[PDB]
C-alpha cells in the first residue's frame with residue numbers, strides 16, 4: 001500500500017489483498033426443446049422485403 | 051439617546067446573565083476503499099485500476 005520496503009509506526013489502514021470466491025454456480029430455467037433454427041433459416045419460402 | 055453636555059446616566063442596579071455559545075470542535079472522520087467503491091468487488095475490475 002505504501003509502495004515502500006520500509007514502514008514507520010502507524011495505524012496504516014490497508015486495502016484487501018486476499019481471494020474469497022472459489023465456487024461458480026449457474027442458474028438457468030428448464031428448457032428441453034432446441035430452438036427452431038431449421039424453420040427460421042432452412043425455409044422453402046421467404047417473405048418479400050416490403 | 052437623550053444627550054446633554056452636563057447630563058450622565060449611572061446604573062443603580064445590576065443583572066447577572068448566563069448565555070450559551072456553541073462552537074463545532076470536530077467532524078466525523080471517514081475512510082474510503084477506492085477499489086470497493088469503483089470495482090464493487092469485481093475480479094475483472096481493478097486490473098484497469100492498477
Ligand SMILES: *[C@@H]1O[C@H](CO)[C@@H](O[C@@H]2O[C@H](CO)[C@@H](O)[C@H](O)[C@H]2NC(C)=O)[C@H](O)[C@H]1NC(C)=O
Pocket residue numbers: 062063064
Ligand atoms: C435590583 O433588582 C433586584 C431584582 O432584580 C431587586 O431585588 C428584588 O427586590 C424586590 C423588593 O423590592 C423583591 O420583591 C424581589 O423578589 C427581589 N428580587 C430578587 C430576585 O430577589 C433589588 O431590590 C434591586 N435593587 C435596587 C437597588 O432596587
